[PDB]
Amino acid sequence: DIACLLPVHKSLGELYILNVNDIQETCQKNAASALLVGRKDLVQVWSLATVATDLCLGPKSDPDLETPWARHPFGRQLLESLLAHYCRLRDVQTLAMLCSVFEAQSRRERERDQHDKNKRLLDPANTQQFDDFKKCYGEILYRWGLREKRAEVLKFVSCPFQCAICHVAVRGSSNFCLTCGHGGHTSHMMEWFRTQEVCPTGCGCHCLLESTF
C-alpha cells in the first residue's frame, strides 16, 4: 500500500461532498474533513473557498455597476495560483474539487460578452483543463469504488406505461421485465419482488430469474 506516496487520499474522497445548491456548507464540511485527515493546506484552501464562493459576491449583469470578484486579485488570480500549486503537486483531487466548487457558483454587446467572460473565477478559455481534472478525478473515484462520488463530481463537467401494481401512470424510474414486458414504478417492484417471485400482473413470468441476468 502506497496511499501515502500519492497526493490524493481515499479517505478524503469518501469524506468530500459536492452539493450544487449550497456551496458554503460543502466548503465547510470539506475543510472539516481535511482537518480530520490532517492536511493543513487543504484546510486553508477550503476556508479560502468558503470565503470566496459566498453568494453575496455574485457578479452583476451590467459591467458598470461594480468590479467583478473575478477581477479581484483574491478571485481569479487566487484560483489560478492555487490550481498552479496543486498542478505542481499533481493533486487531481483538490484540482477537481476547486474546479467544481468554483463552477457551481457560476451555475455594448461585445463589452457585455467580455464582462461575462471576465466575471467568472474559472477562466472560460481553460474549461477543457477543468473538465479533464474532473474526468481524471472521476476515474480515480471509480478506481477506488465510489461510483456515487464519481457521478457527483462528473455532474460539474461543462461538456456532457402503467404500473402492474399500483395501476398509476409511470413516468419516472421504471423496471420492465424483458421476458414478459409488465412493470411500473421502481419502488413498487422493489417491494413486490422482495416477497413474491412471479410477475405482479399474474402472467406467471419469473421476472427475477428471467430479467436479473
Partner 1 sequence: VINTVDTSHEDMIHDAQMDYYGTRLATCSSDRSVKIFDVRNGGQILIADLRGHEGPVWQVAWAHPMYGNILASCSYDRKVIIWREENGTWEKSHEHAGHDSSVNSVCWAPHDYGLILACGSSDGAISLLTYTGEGQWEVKKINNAHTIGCNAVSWAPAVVNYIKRFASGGCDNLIKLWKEEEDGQWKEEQKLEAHSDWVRDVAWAPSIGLPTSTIASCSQDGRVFIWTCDDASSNTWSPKLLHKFNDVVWHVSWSITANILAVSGGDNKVTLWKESVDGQWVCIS
Partner 2 sequence: PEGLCYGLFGDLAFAAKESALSVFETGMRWFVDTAERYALAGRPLAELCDHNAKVARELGRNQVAQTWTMLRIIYCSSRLPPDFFGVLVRDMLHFYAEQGDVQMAVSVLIVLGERVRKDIDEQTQEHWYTSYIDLLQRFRLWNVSNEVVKLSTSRAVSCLNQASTTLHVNCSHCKRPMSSRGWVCDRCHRCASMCAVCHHVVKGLFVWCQGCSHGGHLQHIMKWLEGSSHCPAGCGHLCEYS
Partner 3 sequence: FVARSIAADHKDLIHDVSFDFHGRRMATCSSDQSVKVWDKSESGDWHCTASWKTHSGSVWRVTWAHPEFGQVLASCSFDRTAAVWEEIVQSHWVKRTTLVDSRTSVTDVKFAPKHMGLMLATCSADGIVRIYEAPDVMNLSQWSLQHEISCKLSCSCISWNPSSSRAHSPMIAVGSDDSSPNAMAKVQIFEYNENTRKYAKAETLMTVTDPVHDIAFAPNLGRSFHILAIATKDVRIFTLKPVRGPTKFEIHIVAQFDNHNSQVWRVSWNITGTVLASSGDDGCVRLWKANYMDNWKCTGILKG
Residues that bind partner 1 (CB under 8 A): 1-2, 5-8, 87-88, 90-92, 95, 128-130, 132-133, 135-136, 140, 143, 145
Question: CA torsion, points 86, 147, 54, 72, in degrees to nearest 10?
Answer: 30
Nearest to 144 by CA among 41, 13, 18: 13
CA-CA distance, 150 to 5, in Å (whole number)? 22
The verdict on whether residue 115 carries a ligand-binding annotation is no
Cβ neighbours of residue 37 under 8 Å, at least 6 residues apart? 9, 11, 12, 15
The verdict on whether residue 163 carries a ligand-binding annotation is no
Site residues for partner 3, window 114-143 (CB under 8 A)? 114-115, 118
The verdict on whether residue 203 carries a ligand-binding annotation is yes
Give the one residue of 33, 46, 52, 68 binding partner 3; rule: CB under 8 A.
Answer: 68
The verdict on whether residue 72 carries a ligand-binding annotation is no
Give the one residue of 44, 114, 179, 196 binding partner 2; rule: CB under 8 A.
Answer: 44
Residues 56/63, Cβ–Cβ less than 8 Å = no
Bridge partners for 176 per DSSP: 183
Cα end-to-end span (Å), the chain: 35
Q: In 3-state terms, what secondary structure has residue 183?
A: strand
The verdict on whether residue 177 carries a ligand-binding annotation is yes
Take residue 12 and report the three cell numbers written for it. Answer: 478524503
Interface with Zn ion (CB under 5 A): 163, 166, 177, 179-180, 182, 184-185, 188, 199, 203, 205, 207
Binding site residues, partner 3, CB under 8 A: 63-64, 67-68, 71, 111, 114-115, 118
Note the residues at the interface with partner 2 (CB under 8 A): 38-41, 44-45, 47-48, 51-52, 54, 56-57, 66-67, 69, 72-74, 77-78, 81, 85
User: Which residues belong to the annotated binding site?
Assistant: 166, 177, 182, 185, 188, 199, 203, 205, 207
